[PDB]
Amino acid sequence: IGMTVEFIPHLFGTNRRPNGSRGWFAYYRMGADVVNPNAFRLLNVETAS
Amino acid sequence: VSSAAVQWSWDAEFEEVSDDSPEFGQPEIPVKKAQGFVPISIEALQDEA
Fold first, then answer.
1. Regarding beta strands B2-3 and A25-27, do their DSSP bridges make them parallel or antiparallel, or are they unpaired?
2. Chain A residues with CB within 8 Å of chain B CB
3. In principle, which of A8, A38, B3, B46 could form an S-S bond with A23, CB 3.0–4.6 Å?
4. Is A34 left (phi over 0), alpha (psi -120 to 50) or beta?
């Protein structure tokens, strides 16, 4: 899903009563990985010691 | 049915609001009975006009 922005109309305080504020909630989902690690070549420079 | 008025307050930013449930009451009115009685003799009822 793409960027979705939700607007919370009422936030609550410690005693579960309104404290006079609002909110803006946003999220999205995604995932990725490599299928064939033989189609690339990475160059690594070991600067160890 | 009788009631009071809601009690507001002055509050800062991001302050949980107090509880202000109003209180109700109930007036009562009973109904009573009054009576009068006038007895007349049969002779008088026949004779007087």
1. unpaired
2. 12-15, 17-21
3. A8
4. beta
As a whole number of angstroms, the distance between CA A17 and CA A11 comes to 8
- Measured between CA atoms, the residue of chain A closest to residue B15 is A19
Which residues have CB under 8 Å from A2's CB, separation 6+? A28
B14: chain A residues, CB-CB within 8 Å: 13, 19-21
d(CA A27, CA A11): 18
From which experimental method does this structure derive?
A: cryo-EM
Q: What is the resolution of this structure in A?
A: 3.5
